[PDB]
């Protein structure tokens, strides 16, 4: 029953960290007996909040998709002109797009008739047919070029991060921007108690070491 010792160490690091206080209305100063390879760390308060918020958004989205409860809003008069190869590509991945609330029919210089769209995508598309085509083609090419693997729903606790890679790029972008916008900003006041809650929640995240956009969330200063 062997494992790689380097993976477990990353989680236990943050777990041994007590909050000092907010620094310059931008950072949360944290401090770590048995100081091996680990003392003082400054956490970006925005990156911290954005990270917690993203993982909550991802957990909600993937719980809906895996349980077949993801809302699919009915769309009218949405027909997109597609090439023969594009039409074959959409015909091939129709079943895959249904899992994300994207419901269509391939007709016949063919036509793609979009019947349903999830609420996130309905809002982003805002009637722009050229935008929607680009976004659906991007995912279809991701699938065909082995850059994204299909959503396996054959499996029956839900670890959202085991399916995180399957999420279309357009969904990732929407969740990244919602988390960024909802997050606390630089210049905002935080009490020691709010800082305690923020770091407690961060230490429970799957990846507490970066913000939603992959930039570092903390820097050791010791």
């Amino acid at each position: 029953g062997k494992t790689i010792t380097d993976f477990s160490i990353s989680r236990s690091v943050l777990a041994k960290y007590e909050v000092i206080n907010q620094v310059d209305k931008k950072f949360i100063l944290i401090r770590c007996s048995i100081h091996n390879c680990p003392l003082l760390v400054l956490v970006d308060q925005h990156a911290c909040d954005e990270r917690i918020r993203l993982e909550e958004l991802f957990y909600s989205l993937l719980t809906e998709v895996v349980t077949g409860t993801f809302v699919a809003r009915d769309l009218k008069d949405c027909c997109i002109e597609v090439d023969r190869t594009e039409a074959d590509l959409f015909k091939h991945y129709q079943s895959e797009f249904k899992k994300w609330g994207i419901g269509y029919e391939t007709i016949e210089t063919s036509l793609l008739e979009i019947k349903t769209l999830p609420e996130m995508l309905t809002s982003k598309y805002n009637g722009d047919k050229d935008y929607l085509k680009m976004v659906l083609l991007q995912h279809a090419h991701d699938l065909k070029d082995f850059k994204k693997l299909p959503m396996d729903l054959s499996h029956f606790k839900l670890y959202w991060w085991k399916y995180s890679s399957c999420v279309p790029t357009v969904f990732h972008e929407i969740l990244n921007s919602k988390a960024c916008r909802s997050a606390v900003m630089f210049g905002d006041e935080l009490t020691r108690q709010e800082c305690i809650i923020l770091i407690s929640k961060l230490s429970r995240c799957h990846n507490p070491f970066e913000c939603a956009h992959g930039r570092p969330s903390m820097v050791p200063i010791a």
Partner: protein, 260 residues
């Protein structure tokens, strides 16, 4: 109202502090923004000065501050009045080194002989109840009040009494006065909080709770009483430079988190 001190010994002690003051180090404290306690055992706390983060030995800073206040408010101190009375003979019980009754009595003798001097110049009031020659009946009535809203921890009180008799040179005016001020400063500094392993199940619920409460007590003291005073009147001696370390330059950190 304020009694005039014309003692040459005191004038020379004050000149010595004045010649030691480092202007730039004093500027860091003068405009400090207090962050919080970093280590309760090694007595470390973090502060921000401008856009720089510093690690400060508050044991070292408090020692120098209370020594400076003592020098300033010499012979003009208020009193801290002390059912739960304090007997000097009972305090020395913490020392097995004094394996004799007369060895413990010798210390009290040095202090009681100078009771008038200790009460006048330092507000250290010693009260006797029994005979004048009897040392078992000698109690401590009051201590000097150096900082309003602050009461020193008396954990260090049996060591204060022991050093007052054994360490202080009573044979020279300047060395004697200097030694008493250093002994008051040592008593007045906040206590160290030795690290206790909270994750270890082999320790009782009271041992872990008291440690938490000791940590909370120092944190409240530094934030509400000590750092406001340090910021208000502390003059940094050149020899304190090692106890003030720059841990972070925040403009370099803005670059790390420049864009999201």
């Amino acid at each position: 109202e304020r009694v005039n001190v014309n003692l040459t010994s005191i004038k020379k002690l004050r000149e010595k502090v004045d010649d030691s003051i480092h202007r730039e180090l004093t500027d860091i404290f003068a405009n400090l923004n207090y962050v919080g306690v970093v280590d309760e055992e090694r007595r470390l706390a973090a502060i921000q000065h401008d856009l720089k983060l510093f690690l400060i030995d508050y044991g070292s800073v408090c020692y120098e501050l209370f020594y400076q206040i003592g020098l300033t408010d010499f012979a003009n101190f208020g009193k801290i009045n002390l059912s739960d009375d304090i007997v000097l003979y009972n305090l020395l019980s913490e020392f097995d080194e004094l394996n004799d009754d007369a060895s413990k009595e010798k210390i009290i003798s040095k202090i009681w002989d100078m009771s008038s001097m200790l009460n006048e110049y330092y507000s250290i009031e010693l009260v006797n109840d029994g005979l004048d020659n009897d040392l078992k009946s000698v109690k401590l009535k009051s201590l000097p009040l150096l900082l309003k809203g602050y009461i020193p921890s008396l954990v260090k009180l049996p060591f204060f009494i022991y050093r007052l008799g054994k360490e202080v040179d009573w044979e020279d005016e300047q060395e004697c006065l200097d030694g008493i001020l250093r002994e008051i400063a040592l008593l007045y500094i906040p206590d160290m909080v030795p690290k206790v392993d909270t994750s270890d199940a082999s320790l009782s619920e009271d041992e872990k709770a008291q440690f938490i409460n000791r940590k909370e007590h120092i944190s409240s003291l530094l934030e509400h009483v000590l750092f406001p005073c340090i910021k208000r009147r502390f003059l940094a001696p050149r020899h304190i430079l090692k106890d003030v370390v720059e841990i972070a330059n925040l403009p370099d950190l803005y670059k790390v988190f420049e864009r999201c």
